[PDB]
Amino acid sequence: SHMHVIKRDGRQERVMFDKITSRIQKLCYGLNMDFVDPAQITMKVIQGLYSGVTTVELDTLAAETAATLTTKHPDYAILAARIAVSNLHKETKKVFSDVMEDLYNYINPHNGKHSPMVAKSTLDIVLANKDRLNSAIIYDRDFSYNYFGFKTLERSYLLKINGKVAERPQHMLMRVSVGIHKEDIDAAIETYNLLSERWFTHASPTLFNAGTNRPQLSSCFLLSMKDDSIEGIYDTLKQCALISKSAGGIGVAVSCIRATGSYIAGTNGNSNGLVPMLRVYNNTARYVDQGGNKRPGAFAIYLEPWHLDIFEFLDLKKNTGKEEQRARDLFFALWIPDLFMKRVETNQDWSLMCPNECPGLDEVWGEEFEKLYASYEKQGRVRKVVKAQQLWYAIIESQTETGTPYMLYKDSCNRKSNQQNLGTIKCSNLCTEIVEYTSKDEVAVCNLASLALNMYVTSEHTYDFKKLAEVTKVVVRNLNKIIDINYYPVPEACLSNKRHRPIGIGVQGLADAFILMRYPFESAEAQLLNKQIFETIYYGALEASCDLAKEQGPYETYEGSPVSKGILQYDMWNVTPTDLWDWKVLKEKIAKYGIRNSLLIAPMPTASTAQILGNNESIEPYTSNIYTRRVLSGEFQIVNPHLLKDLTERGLWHEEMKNQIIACNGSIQSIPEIPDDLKQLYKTVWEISQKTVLKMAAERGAFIDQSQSLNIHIAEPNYGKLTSMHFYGWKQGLKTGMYYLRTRP
Amino acid sequence: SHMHVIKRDGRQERVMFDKITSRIQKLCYGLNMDFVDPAQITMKVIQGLYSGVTTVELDTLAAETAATLTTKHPDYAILAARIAVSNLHKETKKVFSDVMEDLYNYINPHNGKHSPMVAKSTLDIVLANKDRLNSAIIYDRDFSYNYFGFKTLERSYLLKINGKVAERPQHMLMRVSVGIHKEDIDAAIETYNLLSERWFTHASPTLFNAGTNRPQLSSCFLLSMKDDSIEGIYDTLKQCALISKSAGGIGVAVSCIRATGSYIAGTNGNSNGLVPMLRVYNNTARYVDQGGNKRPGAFAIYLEPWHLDIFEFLDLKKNTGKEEQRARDLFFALWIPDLFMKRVETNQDWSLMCPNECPGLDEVWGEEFEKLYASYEKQGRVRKVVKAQQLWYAIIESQTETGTPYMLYKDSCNRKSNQQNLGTIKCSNLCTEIVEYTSKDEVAVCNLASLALNMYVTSEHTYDFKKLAEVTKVVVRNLNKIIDINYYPVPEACLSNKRHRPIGIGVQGLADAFILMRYPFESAEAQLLNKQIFETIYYGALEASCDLAKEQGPYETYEGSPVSKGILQYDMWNVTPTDLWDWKVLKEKIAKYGIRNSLLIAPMPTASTAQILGNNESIEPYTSNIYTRRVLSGEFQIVNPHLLKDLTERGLWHEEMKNQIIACNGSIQSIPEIPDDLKQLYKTVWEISQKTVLKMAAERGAFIDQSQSLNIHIAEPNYGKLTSMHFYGWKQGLKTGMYYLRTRP
Numbered sequence A, B: 001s002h003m004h005v006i007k008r009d010g011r012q013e014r015v016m017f018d019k020i021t022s023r024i025q026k027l028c029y030g031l032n033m034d035f036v037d038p039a040q041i042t043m044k045v046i047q048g049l050y051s052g053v054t055t056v057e058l059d060t061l062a063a064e065t066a067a068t069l070t071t072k073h074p075d076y077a078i079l080a081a082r083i084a085v086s087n088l089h090k091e092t093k094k095v096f097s098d099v100m101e102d103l104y105n106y107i108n109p110h111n112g113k114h115s116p117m118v119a120k121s122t123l124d125i126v127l128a129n130k131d132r133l134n135s136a137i138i139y140d141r142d143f144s145y146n147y148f149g150f151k152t153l154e155r156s157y158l159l160k161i162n163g164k165v166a167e168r169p170q171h172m173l174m175r176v177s178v179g180i181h182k183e184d185i186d187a188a189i190e191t192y193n194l195l196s197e198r199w200f201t202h203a204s205p206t207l208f209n210a211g212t213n214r215p216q217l218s219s220c221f222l223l224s225m226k227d228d229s230i231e232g233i234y235d236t237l238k239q240c241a242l243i244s245k246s247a248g249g250i251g252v253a254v255s256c257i258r259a260t261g262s263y264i265a266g267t268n269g270n271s272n273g274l275v276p277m278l279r280v281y282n283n284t285a286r287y288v289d290q291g292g293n294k295r296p297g298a299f300a301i302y303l304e305p306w307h308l309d310i311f312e313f314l315d316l317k318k319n320t321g322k323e324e325q326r327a328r329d330l331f332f333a334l335w336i337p338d339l340f341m342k343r344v345e346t347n348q349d350w351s352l353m354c355p356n357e358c359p360g361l362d363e364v365w366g367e368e369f370e371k372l373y374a375s376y377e378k379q380g381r382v383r384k385v386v387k388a389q390q391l392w393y394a395i396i397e398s399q400t401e402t403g404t405p406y407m408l409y410k411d412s413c414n415r416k417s418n419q420q421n422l423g424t425i426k427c428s429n430l431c432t433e434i435v436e437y438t439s440k441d442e443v444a445v446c447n448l449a450s451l452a453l454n455m456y457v458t459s460e461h462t463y464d465f466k467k468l469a470e471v472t473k474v475v476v477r478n479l480n481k482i483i484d485i486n487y488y489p490v491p492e493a494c495l496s497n498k499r500h501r502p503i504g505i506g507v508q509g510l511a512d513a514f515i516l517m518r519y520p521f522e523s524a525e526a527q528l529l530n531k532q533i534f535e536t537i538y539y540g541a542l543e544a545s546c547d548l549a550k551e552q553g554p555y556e557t558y559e560g561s562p563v564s565k566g567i568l569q570y571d572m573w574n575v576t577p578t579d580l581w582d583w584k585v586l587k588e589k590i591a592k593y594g595i596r597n598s599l600l601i602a603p604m605p606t607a608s609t610a611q612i613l614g615n616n617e618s619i620e621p622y623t624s625n626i627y628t629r630r631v632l633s634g635e636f637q638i639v640n641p642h643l644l645k646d647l648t649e650r651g652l653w654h655e656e657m658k659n660q661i662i663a664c665n666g667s668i669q670s671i672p673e674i675p676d677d678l679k680q681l682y683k684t685v686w687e688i689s690q691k692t693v694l695k696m697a698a699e700r701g702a703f704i705d706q707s708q709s710l711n712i713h714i715a716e717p718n719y720g721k722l723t724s725m726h727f728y729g730w731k732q733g734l735k736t737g738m739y740y741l742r743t744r745p
């Protein structure tokens, strides 16, 4: 008949338009009514309406229209967040316990199987404790997310039932706290309130599988080859298949595979090298997706540069060429020793050999690698001799073209790690921050936890240090409770992760801490500031693991580590820390009790986590002050809201200032309406000299017991800033030369 | 600030959308609610709304959107009429008297002059009689117009004040009845109620200037040249300028101007002919517009075919050629005698002469013209001799290309008219229906009144005859009261229009009378029907003028007319009328009292009048069953609503039948969903053989004392149907061969 809409109860009515403005103005309380205008939003919604429309599409399109209108006044972000979050909170259930009973009592709607979303012990903990725990949840905190962080949180992370999302966000975060803190409830309420107050957040597989039926909370996996045979290659392929099933990240050390042309004693033939093998890993990276297709399964391939197939390895992730000689859905990385640095330095030659001819090489680092490599370089057992600057030119061609390979430094990582007593660290994970020991028997597993920073900044614009160590103590107790609950997908993972027991802590949003502390990025108080911050994080981490080892005893391989010898991570950098803390009593209690976890700190990139909480990616500056937004039918420009927060107060903001920053791509310094302080507080990273950031990485990574991601931003391809940049990173002592060479077009 | 609309009081408010659907559903009472849908109309209105919009634009766009949605169901025409008419009736004043005081008390808003819209005697009649007359008006009748008839009535006919229309339609029709019936009120209330019940309507200059300050109620003007000198040409140009100022229609007899090359005794030169002279009349037709630019001033130019400049006259209204040899904003017509018919008939020759050489020719018709033309054809005084079929081929080239010239028959008009005693009828008006005597002293003026037809059809589908003569009596009393109130623009007009005193009555919408009487157009009861109708109209007209002559005496030149000799118009056609009436007592009372008006009946085209009342153009069939509508941003297709009225009852109407009639251009007979009666009741005029219509014109024009318009519709250029058509019209005896040759593309 007429234009009827399908009202959410399931019924239909006539189109009465004042229900829209009746609802929006109800959801506009507490905003600037001088620019909050329900009529424009209603008008663009009615531009899209038709007959027979479910009303949840009208609320979705209402929040979408408010998100597109956010450019006119910044309160429409708060409005659009209230529209989407109110749309969800009207939909699903109020009580957490009946949601959990609905998830456990799930039935596959065409197979009849009692196929739960949560394990029965999780439901046991909930139903035994629902009275305190339903009282602990606070739904006032769900209106605190950004809109785009809420849509990113909704599209993939909330547990769905037949396509309809059936979890509020506090149901997910309380589900995580039950999923980790099993027996105890006080830790679940301190962990819940410290969690939902957005102080720290766990990693994404923890948000996937906390308390579910297959609890695989880990996110870091480091695998090396079992053998240089078909059985080793395909058994390693099997382990990468299972681990990439249970939503992990896999970095593979592929150093020990014989090269093209070496003799095969079994079938009297010659090998074809690494290129079809890594092509098999290419199709495996396409087939298995992490979890329920939530993100594609990605593999890192690490190769040391002395291997003979290095040129076809570097020409492998490209765009042109034959298709059968490209494997472009992987991530390639070079695990470079100091000798290739020295031979590129003085234009000498370089010996590409085959690890069947020269066996047992990648397990040897430093001066011993110099002696063994020189002794094989003497005997003439090598196969090819290439001038080192030619291969360096090939590396800069590959990084210039695609950004791959990554570059890590072998002797720097093997020298400055707490797992020296085990052997030689072969590889690292996909995002190049977990530097741990791998073997044929031990497959390295590490857990993650990302602390935010800008929630700690007080109103005095003086940073809070004493809170940060305290939350770090709660985090270390969380991860150390994670390691003993996790279900490892392969049997080699449990022995490594329970013998050595590592954790991982990484912060996100350093640029917001600098803006809210009101310092320039290349100032003196910034370089003092991050140094003091990671002294606080590192100190509180060591105090927390000390207080755990006082209660459960240290890990199984402690005596032999340099921490048992008193050398902490900063002395391996030979940098005495500041007088901000008391390190003597810390080293006394460590010398009397040990520590519980081997490796502690690890700055991860946190793309998706910082996408949720609105912070910037972990430590880098803003890419531009204008950042785009992916909206259906609108992909548009939103300025940095801290910059806009200062501009509305300083008066220089007007109705075309956005258009004034369109034609400069974030560069606010070219405009004549300038207080000449925003040019220091809001430096575009393209307008930031990279070597100051590298010095800041030398200080901060000098207070980190693992590596850290390092997105290199360079506007134009030039070999001097690249070559001097990598050599400068090697001279400062960094464990990671690069993670991406990013060139803006 | 926000989106505020300017509410009609002059204020502003927020955009609240349920005021729209709150109003439309209030204006939807009495319609089919199964398809009446306010939400679609509201949706397309809100597609056009913006901030700072006057609400009368929202009602205008609402009625416009309903007019475009009328295709889905025919009740949206009734809706859109109620929207526009309610928009006007909310706007202007309720009382007629204060509107008249506002119009008389008008002041030019930048000259201060008391420049009235009505004369002071009109306001005297209103203010002396406002108590009965404000009670007589019925505003229930304004919701009876069509939408497009109301917009056509509003854009040009209602008297505006500074661009804002300040007259309701009943204010205009009551203003007309006061403007004609001055002293009497009973005639103003019978005339008002018979008028506003849409029975008959006056002509368009009557609607322009009834009771205004310059009352020029006439619409027919026939002028001939005073002299074949510069003084005669430019004095005639002066009279055409003044008459075209006061909104008349001018037909000019340009027979008596000497041709190209004749000697000029004053300045010893030779004339250039007619072409630059008619070019001067071209620019005069562009400059002076009728009234307040309400329609462009148009001139008819009549020429008899024996004049020497006839070839450049026929090649004059074209599209190509040099610009200085074209006069295309005129209307050209040939005033053909029988001799050109006979010489084209038998392929003989034809004598093109010059009226300076052969003087006193156009004042002579018939056999006397044959004798005088043969005597000048004998003496060799002629100048050119052209084969007659060549000039006939030139005429068919001109009518084929543009439709001009018109064709009238000289001896047929001079033989069958009541003004034989005066002399020779030279010319006729622009629309070729007023055939009256012109002279140097008498400039012919005729008034018009168009009766509708389909209001007379009773529910029994038997036509009402006794009402039609009665309304015809009221009409004849109206026009005879018009002639004595009118203000003639030139002094020669008053002597003609008061000596001979003619009137004019023409009907509109014959196709609707045939459909509502349910007969085929080419049936037997149609040809019986229009014959009976014009016997009724002609009989009631003669009875009315008889009853006027019983009270005031006949006109000044009665004794000498053939009506005084007893011969009425039908005996000049030698057709005895039917036994429907009593003609003997009529001819007795005429023989004892005479008649008051010389010429009575005149079928005019009525483009604009039938555009108001929704009827078809006067006597022709429908051009197509689908007719387009001019709407801003929508120029679309609406079917004939009587056809649609039968299709919704007979069930064959469905939701794509319009699309089934798109690809046939009104031809409903090609579709397979056919009751084979609609193919007879709804014949497209392109699917109608023209000679049956010509026979119907012989009967109906055999009962008309003047000529009648005749739009000839022929789909393709073919010389046989044209030539046989004009010869057939001459053989039936018609006074008008053609008014347009229309070819659909």
Ligand SMILES: Nc1ncnc2c1ncn2[C@H]1C[C@H](O)[C@@H](COP(=O)(O)OP(=O)(O)OP(=O)(O)O)O1
Residues within 6 Å of the ligand: A005, A007, A008, A009, A013, A014, A015, A016, A017, A019, A020, A023, A055, A056, A058, A059, A062, A090
């Ligand atoms: N009758 C209607 N016609 C068109 N849109 C409507 C109508 N009613 C509500 N809407 C719009 C307004 C909102 O933008 C959106 C959601 O309305 P909403 O009221 O929340 O559904 P609902 O009526 O079931 O919720 P609730 O019953 O709790 O009020 O749909």
Ligand SMILES: Nc1ncnc2c1ncn2[C@H]1C[C@H](O)[C@@H](COP(=O)(O)OP(=O)(O)OP(=O)(O)O)O1
Residues within 6 Å of the ligand: A228, A229, A230, A231, A257, A258, A263, A264, A265, A266, A267, A270, A271, A272
């Ligand atoms: N048929 C083959 N095609 C391509 N590559 C092969 C083939 N067989 C073996 N390889 C590669 C896989 C390993 O990289 C390598 C050795 O495999 P492996 O089983 O150890 O050889 P083998 O034991 O039979 O001879 P060897 O004793 O020399 O190793 O050669």
Ligand SMILES: Nc1ncnc2c1ncn2[C@H]1C[C@H](O)[C@@H](COP(=O)(O)OP(=O)(O)OP(=O)(O)O)O1
Residues within 6 Å of the ligand: B005, B007, B008, B009, B013, B014, B015, B016, B017, B019, B020, B023, B055, B056, B058, B059, B062, B090
């Ligand atoms: N506040 C509004 N915002 C947008 N459109 C409106 C608003 N109010 C009325 N309209 C629409 C409804 C109608 O289609 C059109 C004209 O409204 P209308 O009510 O007749 O003006 P009005 O309010 O001055 O008349 P009245 O005072 O007699 O009610 O404008």
Ligand SMILES: Nc1ncnc2c1ncn2[C@H]1C[C@H](O)[C@@H](COP(=O)(O)OP(=O)(O)OP(=O)(O)O)O1
Residues within 6 Å of the ligand: B228, B229, B230, B231, B257, B258, B263, B264, B265, B266, B267, B271, B272
């Ligand atoms: N100068 C001119 N240019 C063009 N046409 C002219 C001119 N003078 C006269 N005519 C035309 C207009 C008339 O159609 C025609 C006669 O005009 P008119 O005044 O009667 O001439 P006339 O009286 O001086 O000489 P005649 O006695 O021959 O008419 O000649």
Ligand SMILES: Nc1ccn([C@@H]2O[C@H](COP(=O)(O)OP(=O)(O)O)[C@@H](O)[C@H]2O)c(=O)n1
Residues within 6 Å of the ligand: A203, A204, A205, A219, A220, A221, A248, A249, A250, A290, A295, A298, A429, A430, A431, A432, A448, A604, A605, A606, A607, A608, A609, A610
């Ligand atoms: N595309 C990616 C990126 C990272 N990761 C893994 O997630 C870890 C940290 O990356 P991250 O914190 O940016 O991942 P998110 O938590 O943001 O999803 C890495 O060590 C990888 O193991 C992944 O599996 N797939």
Ligand SMILES: Nc1ccn([C@@H]2O[C@H](COP(=O)(O)OP(=O)(O)O)[C@@H](O)[C@H]2O)c(=O)n1
Residues within 6 Å of the ligand: B203, B204, B205, B219, B220, B221, B248, B249, B250, B290, B295, B298, B429, B430, B431, B432, B448, B604, B605, B606, B607, B608, B609, B610
């Ligand atoms: N374009 C026109 C059409 C007609 N007319 C005059 O109006 C008379 C009848 O034409 P009509 O009845 O179609 O004119 P309307 O009343 O429809 O405007 C003609 O005799 C002309 O004198 C005109 O002046 N201009």
Ligand SMILES: [Mg+2]
Residues within 6 Å of the ligand: none
């Ligand atoms: Mg509701």
Ligand SMILES: [Mg+2]
Residues within 6 Å of the ligand: A228, A229
């Ligand atoms: Mg082997």
Ligand SMILES: [Mg+2]
Residues within 6 Å of the ligand: none
């Ligand atoms: Mg109103």
Ligand SMILES: [Mg+2]
Residues within 6 Å of the ligand: B228, B229
């Ligand atoms: Mg003269």
